[PDB]
Symmetry: D2
Subunit: 323 residues, 4 copies
């Protein structure tokens, strides 16, 4: 998985969901008066509306990622072997990983607001159900001002500022930023010949600025490539051009089927790619086998309802036969 933010005119949030098997992913709009019950903290009976993609195997919205009506987005990504969830701790706000996105997005308008709520957080090892045990995750949260990473590990809980607005998988976010130092030389422009002024070296290609940028599908490589591609993307003139650019950023680190064998010829691939406009509350998406962008507008729903609004995902190729 790779989550990013991107600023064009509006502000965007979204991610590649990379895995070897799809359950029943659905787009779910959680309206304001859908009651959020939490196992160990106060229930939010009235809360901010939420749109995200979720696992369609429960009556509760099990969001992989989501934005709320106030322009704050949040995404969980695999953090296998690194995630550690705790026992209940008296004095702390005890929240399960499965409840975590509803907990933040339900009551925070901004990243700064989330940073305060996170001050007494303790992420507790409580499964949604016996059938559906907790996944190991870390989180990126973002609004139009900034983003942060939330990592609960053996050492404890850390909340980092994200100066690049990108997150992938392992390892800890401090290592991911540090590894960027190794790439200071990369550029969008043709480099000078610094190798030696004794020989003429020929600029035989465009794009030599970037040689060194890694192209594999590992978590660190994808973080570096995604970061370089996002930081150096142009902004665009319209909504349609902007989400174009955004999906180009996500394509840069997507996982094509056949390339990432995780087991007995079992293939991890980008099952969906999401792009969310934080100002407009629109959840755009593509899937592996539908390249057309689909838009689900949370503001077209009645956000005062008390029941989830659940749309299946458009999964088959949607082709424009033009002649």
């Amino acid at each position: 998985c790779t989550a990013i933010t991107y600023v064009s005119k509006d502000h965007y949030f979204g991610r590649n969901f990379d895995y070897e098997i799809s359950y029943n992913e659905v787009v779910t709009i959680t309206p304001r008066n859908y009651k959020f019950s939490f196992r160990e903290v106060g229930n939010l009976d009235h809360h901010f509306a939420i749109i995200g993609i979720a696992a369609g195997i429960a009556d509760y919205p099990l969001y992989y990622d989501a934005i709320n009506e106030k322009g704050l987005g949040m995404a969980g990504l695999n953090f296998s072997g690194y995630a550690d969830y705790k026992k209940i701790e008296e004095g702390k706000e005890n929240v399960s990983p499965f409840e975590f996105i509803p907990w933040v997005l339900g009551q925070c308008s901004t990243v700064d607001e989330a940073k305060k709520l996170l001050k007494n957080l303790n992420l507790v090892n409580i499964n949604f159900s016996d059938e559906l045990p907790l996944s190991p995750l870390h989180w990126l949260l973002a609004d139009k001002e900034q983003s942060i990473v939330v990592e609960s590990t053996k050492e404890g809980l850390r909340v980092f500022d994200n100066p690049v607005g990108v997150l992938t998988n392992n390892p800890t976010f401090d290592y991911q930023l540090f590894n960027l130092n190794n790439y200071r030389v990369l550029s969008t422009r043709t480099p000078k010949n610094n190798f030696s002024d004794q020989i003429e070296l020929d600029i035989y290609s465009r794009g030599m600025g970037g040689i060194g940028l890694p192209g594999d599908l590992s978590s660190v490589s994808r973080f570096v490539k995604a970061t370089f591609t996002k930081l150096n993307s142009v902004s665009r003139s319209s909504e349609y051009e902007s989400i174009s650019q955004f999906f180009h950023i996500l394509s840069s680190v997507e996982q094509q089927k056949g390339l990432c064998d995780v087991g007995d010829e079992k293939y991890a691939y980008t099952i969906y790619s999401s792009c969310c406009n934080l100002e407009k509350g629109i959840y755009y998406y593509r899937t592996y086998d539908n390249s057309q962008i689909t838009a689900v507008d949370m503001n077209k729903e009645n956000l005062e309802k008390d029941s989830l609004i659940v749309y299946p995902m458009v999964e088959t190729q949607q082709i424009n036969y033009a002649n």
Copy 2:
């Protein structure tokens, strides 16, 4: 640019068109009785029908790439500094680069037929017009059996068998092939710890078998990653699944605006990406700002006509507003 062939059940041919300014790219079908006049060789009043994308110019189909009704595909890719076109040479079939796609596709049903035709070729330095001078190019040709590469350089004209079915830009195809030798260790599977049996190294990420795959936008790196992506790709035989995978291959090496500055913030990008089904004579494309796949099927035209049939490209996002 990057051009590839791919086989699922059918055989597919297509390219990324990578340049810093879009002109008037249009899908153009050349029917069988559109007379081809050649400046220095014998005319073809009747020939195979062709579909491809061209520069949108009334008087002649100036193709960047195309396929014919017999399942032969051909594309010109940039080859700046390496391309060399020749004086008229007596006893040769003297053919300009701008005429080269119509010359081969017009009378060749297979790559083998192209091989025999190319024995007598001399590519000559004649512009289409004073306003429209030749580009430096080389060519990938392909059918359901094989692909070849054609390079006219200062040393002369070579025809290479292309065992990987991929072409990008500079240098010569022999170097490009050789360089793959350096990537023998890349894998779709997790590598063993060969580094030392005295220490334990942790598999902290998925996709570590690809580490060392270049991810930059230069010509050689794009060649390596397209090749690795194409050769290790998997897909169902169904059409939608197959073109989906093909477009993911092209996505793996596309150029995002902002990342390749070719001189004072003029950015090279993947203006369009094509995929052609050689068996069904269908030209599918995406554009930088339209992610939906568009199909133009040469068989729905009247291929006995003698005028160009030109379609504007669908260039803005065609989005499914699903709610």
Copy 3:
């Protein structure tokens, strides 16, 4: 700087000293009755004998690295921007970094003995003199059983077990070990063609198993190359063949004059390379401009002396003229 341990039959400890200026380096034997007066802990009037290279600018052994008569080694290596030395701390053994090698090598026979001593350590910010401010360092220690790394950073004092017997410069040892994870595929053997079984790739060179191994003079690169070369070294068990292999390992990551510009054409270079036989108390060294190995044997001295025994370093080429 790079420091390594190595086992053949005997156990060896040594380092490359990589810097832009020489501080009158000398081989110094500190005999047993040379009184150590520490600024904040108790004096050691009788201690283990020590042999190392030191800065010959005081009648005090200002060691860069050394071993003692009981086969324990210690080396200080640049750690600039990461090292943090502390205020005097109550209930701790407050040792200055300039006293640190004497403190440990004077009273410990083994790494395990050093580990106990290190539990109570606080490295204090006390300069040898107003004319010689403290250097930012971190330390490798080693005996015939194991090696450890000591880092005093802003977060505090950490002692690591060192599973590879190598250390370089920045960053912290945890990153350095984690980064090895990236090189799991490197091999001493020709790799299989894993890229694709659809194509034949030629083994055009010996040594292809190592492709990916970094060759630059940076701290992480040098850590990776010294680790791979050390762990994959072979040699027979004789003294000369063992130390030969050891200097070959150090040679792999030495810094050639001209290649590392630290400033205004100021060149950091490997001023010396050391190899110490822990069992025999022999300090072997080469220098940039003397490729011959020189040996100083601690045990040929009167170790009951009370004054430093100082040998000049042979720093001009000692050539065998065969005719």
Copy 4:
């Protein structure tokens, strides 16, 4: 193998010889009246004196490399699968590769005379004996002005100007030179942060300008590292500092025992490193097991004699015991 030239007042020529077995290497001086009989060309009864290292497996001087008394150097380096020797061709000068160093060095004082002598060369597939079959080789020749590469391949005989003064093993020299274009950005100085101006990247280590330089033992990687290390080396004009720098260039790309397994745990290693002063006729060398530089001065012999003068190689460490 790696062969280099280097200039620092005097002009130096030299090589690493890398193989997994020894053929009793000796320094051999061939005096002016030692008769060279050639199978297919005219004998040299009188010729220039030569010094070099040879396989001590026959009474004929089977030089791996050598220099003559006139300042011209020539070395044979492994070129396995690339070298191709021919049948005798009427109207050529037909020379076996075993004859080639005596043929050239016997009678040329400069690289230009070598160029003229080479114009009609045909390297013929004729063994020294039934017992010693030819080795597949290419050559570096150098004098104080320039160096050249000679490659007889399946496609023919080519002579290249060598603008870097470096040669290794496979592939052809034109690819080796072309590949340097890929490393145009490497620098001896710390690069700026081109990655992005939006974030701060720290210079946590010295030598970061070199990051990307390959450090493995393969033919292309050593060519690239030897080239960067030679071209950026800072020259001291005195003899000992000059040969000292030279031997550090060759150490940069030496092959350590255990790291290059050529099959069945048989290990390729730098058996010797040579540095020849062309002006003075001195053959300086080190071996894998002797770090001290040994020097053989051709001009101290009676070069008017007619028999070979052999200096067996020193193959124990020559340790300077200082106490």
